[PDB]
Structure formats: C-alpha cells, structure tokens
Design a protein around this ligand. Structure first.
Ligand code: FAD
Ligand code: NAP
Ligand code: ECE
Length: 511
C-alpha cells in the first residue's frame, strides 16, 4: 500500500512519454502500469500477419528527442509491428523507464479521495497506490469485439481474434475463414491468402481502399529524411493530419474531368490512404460532388481489378467515402485467386457455427479449420467505462458519461480532478503520435504549474466541457463524416491547447 506523486495507466506511445515527462522534467515520483507483460501498448498486442502502419515510417514515432530521430532506422516506407514494438522498447530502455512500470498488471479501480485530495489506485496484484495525479494513456481502443455467433463453441477448430494472435502460430495449408474487412481485415487477408489452402472472407461492409505503396528504402533515402527532420516535424505539427504531405486546398470540382483523374491516379500510384483523401483535393470530406468523384475513381479501380463480376460486386464499396480511408498491399487482387471465396453476409448472413465450419442462411457449410475474427474493438469509452473509476463525491465514470463520452480538450472531464486522458474522447484525428506528444506535453506543463503554484486540484467546468462538445459537433457536421473526435486538425488543436494554457487555464476550476 504505497504512495506517490503520479500514476500513469498504460505503456504504449502515450504512457511511455508521460512517465518520461513527469519523472524527468517535473521531478515527480511516477509509477506506470500495464496488463501487457511489456511496453508497446497497441503494438504489444496486435501481432497478426501483415500488421502495418498507415502512417509513413519516418513519422510514426516520437519527435521530441533529436538524437533518437538520427539513430533509429526502418526497412520499408511503412513500419511493421515488430519494428514499432522494437522501437518502443529501445525508447523505453533509452530513457531509463522499465523501472517505473509494473507490467503484467491491471489497474482495476481509481477512487478519488475527497478529503486526502488523492487518487486511490489498485492493481490486480493487490497493491494500492495513492497519487495526486493520474494520467490515463489507455488508448482509443478498448475490449476486443467478438460477436457471439450461434454454436460458436461447437467449433472444433481454432478461433482467433486479430488482437490476440498467438505468437508463432501458422495457418499455412489450413482452411481459414476471416470475419471483418476493416484495416486489420484487409491486411490479414492479403497476408493469409497466398499461404492457406482456402480462404473464405465474410464481408459485411466492403470499404474503400487505395494501394499503400509500401516500398523498400536504402540508408541514403533515410539520410535525406534525417537531414531535413526539423522541417518535417515543423510541417507536420502545422498541418491538419500530420501524415507528412502537404494538404491540398484545391477544390475537386474546381478542375477538369481529366485533371481530376490525373491527380487521382498519381495519388493512387504513389499510394497512401490519407494522401488520397487529403493530399489530392481539399474538399473531399466536405463537398458532396468532390466525394463522389473520389469514390467513383476507387470503384473503377475495383471493377478493373476483380475479374469475376459476381465477386466484384460483393466487394464494391458503396456510398459516401466518409469512413477513415484504408490502404492495402493488393487486397482487391486476392479475390482473383481460385482458393479465395467472398461471402456477402448482408445478403447471406451467418446462421450458425458448427463443428466443422460456418453455415450461412443459404444452407452451405463453409468448411473451416480456423476462424479469424478481424472484428476490432468497442471504442474509447470502453477502456474507462470498464472500471471502478469514481470521481468527486464517489461519482462513477459510467454515471458521469450518462450518454456519449465527453471531455474538455480531449484530455479532461468534469468531476474528475487531477485526472487526465491521453486520447480521451473529442480529441484530434491525426497521425496519433504527434497528437500524443501535444497532449502529454500539455498535461506535463499543467502538472508542473500545479506543483509550482500550490494547486490542490484542477478540473474543467461542465460549462466548458459542453462548449467543447459543441465545437467538436459543429465541426463534425460540417464534413461528410456526420452523414467522437475534434476534426479541426493538429495545428488548430495545438493553438487551442496553447491558448488555454497562456490564458490561465480557461474553462478550469483551479483550487
Ligand atoms: C493494427 C493497428 C495499426 C495502427 N496503425 C496506426 C497508424 O498507422 N497511425 C496511427 O496514427 N495510429 C494507428 N493505430 C492506432 C494506434 O493505437 C495509435 O497510433 C497508438 O498506438 C496509440 O498509443 P497509446 O499509447 O495512446 O495507446 P495504446 O497503444 O492503445 O496503449 C494503451 C495501453 O493501455 C493498457 N490498459 C488499458 N486499460 C488498462 C488498465 N486498466 N490497466 C493496465 N493497462 C491498461 C492496455 O493494455 C494498452 O497496452 C493503429 C492501431 C492498430 C491496432
Ligand atoms: N492504419 C492501420 O494500418 C491500421 C491497421 C489496423 C487497425 N487500425 C485501426 O484500429 C481500429 C480497428 O481496426 P480493425 O480493422 O481491427 O476494426 P474495424 O475498423 O472496427 O473493422 C471492423 C470490421 O469487422 C466487421 N464486423 C464487425 N462486427 C461484425 C459482425 N458481428 N459480423 C460481421 N462483421 C463484423 C466490420 O463490418 P462493418 O464495418 O459493416 O460493421 C468491419 O469490416 C481502426 O479504427 C483502425 O483505424 C489501423
Ligand atoms: O490511421 C489512423 C488509425 C487510427 C485512427 C486515428 C489515427 O490514424
């Protein structure tokens, strides 16, 4: 039953930096915690085949330490999970942090003590920590999502969730079904297709995907990037999404059918999902006609790629190109293989799982040895809403988030003092690490200020939280995503966080 200045929940990008900042800049005694048996967070857990970043390799990392940027290396233009995981372990060892982290250790309640003005925090190892500050780096993701299919437990084969992939497991020569065609699904599908005896993909909503263009690089290309890194990060910190391309301000309809498609083809060829949505035109997300053009281009690629038309149509993405854009390493092409079958489960849904496989409503048994669920997770809400987290006067987090989850500035919420969030709700939608730094940096300032000036407790007003929900909402419904995040872009997000701090923490009850 110990007592410290600060607790950090989680050891991915966000939890790792927060420890570094709170211990080494602000001198605070600081303990880190993670269920996981080591660091990496998202990348400790997802070791499924083909797991790859959407963010180019040079930019999906910390920026804050200039020696590190010069010494780290990568193989391709996008970075794989082993390589990311490895990088976070180098980072963890480089800044001397293993020793602040209790691994294999779940934080299971967070009681705020109104009279001691402290947070009482308990582990599944029995321990208790009493801390003045809590920093939640629990991520945008929550519990694995895992639809309970009828008869599932009759299945005599192995079932695997993408995020619980057994290290070392091979599906080579097995008959495998995959459910889900999200970002994970496309990846695990491209990578499985060539090795398995047969692949059945259960598609519910086919999505829009552009080539990822993941190319090999030589040490000289890296060294041209290394030489220009102050400008790269300054540029990225001053863009909206920080994916490393200039963001277009050219309206789609402001140029010609041929020009429009010329631009859409160079982007296709160059590769990159965000690059397609935002590197090409500036209104794809905000003008109806801009959007339809982008979407149409992609469907023509799909009909150019899938030879058999009954298959093509099952994989044909429909309607607004207003989900997060995917990119792949040859996804549509997989459906030309004789040992891949597509099952459109809107038209022909799963009726049940039986001993030997999956049965659809048409009454065909799809014989499977392995059923892989690429069905994702259950939202930000989920990693908080699954705990004894209570704020002032014992108020429960799930009681406090009576409806949609909320925050002020993506890092805080009313009735939860000295309690912060890294990637809480209504935060930025960007290449995450640069946003994680913004958040951790602001959180570490705020906490340095609190100690230096003798602040007992800080928390936002419910007035302010609601003003933020409105700002996020007004900006959302100006885009085609409407038809959970602040969508004004990193640069605006940074000026806002900075103004609030320069303005004496406006929207915050300081005690
Ligand atoms: C396959 C995949 C690819 C991705 N690619 C990209 C990309 O290219 N670009 C991008 O910007 N984003 C990407 N993301 C999103 C990605 O999660 C973020 O970029 C980033 O990893 C977030 O890191 P984090 O430290 O904030 O949270 P996480 O890495 O999610 O770490 C959170 C940790 O909190 C822990 N935790 C939660 N509750 C508790 C508790 N009660 N006790 C102890 N521990 C707890 C979890 O175990 C977890 O390890 C991807 C995600 C996935 C799954
Ligand atoms: N950038 C990257 O390289 C990368 C890679 C992987 C993951 N990620 C991130 O991590 C998050 C998770 O991605 P993800 O692909 O694991 O999950 P996801 O985006 O949530 O994809 C979910 C998939 O499962 C399907 N699905 C869900 N429940 C189902 C059910 N009961 N029956 C049939 N199908 C079902 C969905 O279909 P519907 O859509 O019709 O519901 C969808 O195809 C994403 O937000 C993504 O940004 C990023
Ligand atoms: O591409 C991504 C994946 C996670 C969602 C926001 C970050 O950007």
């Amino acid at each position: 039953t110990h007592t410290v200045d600060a607790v950090v929940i989680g050891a991915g990008f966000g939890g790792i930096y927060a420890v570094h900042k709170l211990h080494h800049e602000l001198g605070l005694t600081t303990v880190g915690f993670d269920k996981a048996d080591g660091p990496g967070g998202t990348w400790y857990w997802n070791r499924y085949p083909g797991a790859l970043s959407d963010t180019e390799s040079h930019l999906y990392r910390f920026s804050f330490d200039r020696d590190l940027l010069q010494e780290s290396t990568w193989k391709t233009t996008y970075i794989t999970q082993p390589e990311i995981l490895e990088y976070l372990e180098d980072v963890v060892d480089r800044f001397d942090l293993r020793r602040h982290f209790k691994f294999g250790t779940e934080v299971t309640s967070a009681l705020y003590l109104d009279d001691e003005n402290l947070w009482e925090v308990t582990t599944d190892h029995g321990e208790v920590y009493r801390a003045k500050y809590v920093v939640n780096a629990v991520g945008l993701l929550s519990a694995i999502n895992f639809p309970n299919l009828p008869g599932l437990d009759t299945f005599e084969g192995e079932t695997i969730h993408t995020a619980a992939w057994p290290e070392g497991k091979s599906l080579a020569g097995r008959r495998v079904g995959v459910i889900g065609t999200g970002s994970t699904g496309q990846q695990v599908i491209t990578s499985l297709a060539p090795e398995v005896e047969h692949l059945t993909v259960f598609v519910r909503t086919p999505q829009y995907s552009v080539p990822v263009g993941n190319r090999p690089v030589n040490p000289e290309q890296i060294a041209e990037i290394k030489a220009d890194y102050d400008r790269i990060w300054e540029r990225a910190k001053n863009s909206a999404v920080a994916f490393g391309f200039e963001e277009s301000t050219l309206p789609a309809m402001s140029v010609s059918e041929e020009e429009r498609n010329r631009i859409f083809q160079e982007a296709w060829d160059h590769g990159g999902g965000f690059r397609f949505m935002f590197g090409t035109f500036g209104d794809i997300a905000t003008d109806e006609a801009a959007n339809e053009a982008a979407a149409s281009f992609i469907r023509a690629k799909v009909a150019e790629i899938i030879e058999d038309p009954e298959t093509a149509r099952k994989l044909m993405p429909k309607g607004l190109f207003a989900k997060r854009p995917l990119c792949d390493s040859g996804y549509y092409e997989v459906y030309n293989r004789p040992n891949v079958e597509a099952v459109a489960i809107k038209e022909n849904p799963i009726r049940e799982v039986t001993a030997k496989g999956v049965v659809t409503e048409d009454g065909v048994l799809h014989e499977l040895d392995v059923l892989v669920f690429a069905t994702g997770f259950d939202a930000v809400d989920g990693n908080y809403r699954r705990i004894e987290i209570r704020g002032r006067d014992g108020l429960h987090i799930n009681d406090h988030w009576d409806g949609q989850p909320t925050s002020y500035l993506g890092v805080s919420t009313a009735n939860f003092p000295n309690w912060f969030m890294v990637l809480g709700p209504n935060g930025p939608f960007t290449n995450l690490p640069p946003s994680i730094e913004t958040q951790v940096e602001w959180i570490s300032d705020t906490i340095g200020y609190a100690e230096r000036n003798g602040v007992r407790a800080i928390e936002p007003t419910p007035e302010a939280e609601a003003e933020w929900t409105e700002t996020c909402t007004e900006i959302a419904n100006a885009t085609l995503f409407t038809k959970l995040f602040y969508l004004g872009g990193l640069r605006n997000y940074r000026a806002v966080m900075a103004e609030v701090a320069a303005d004496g923490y406006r929207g915050f009850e300081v005690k």
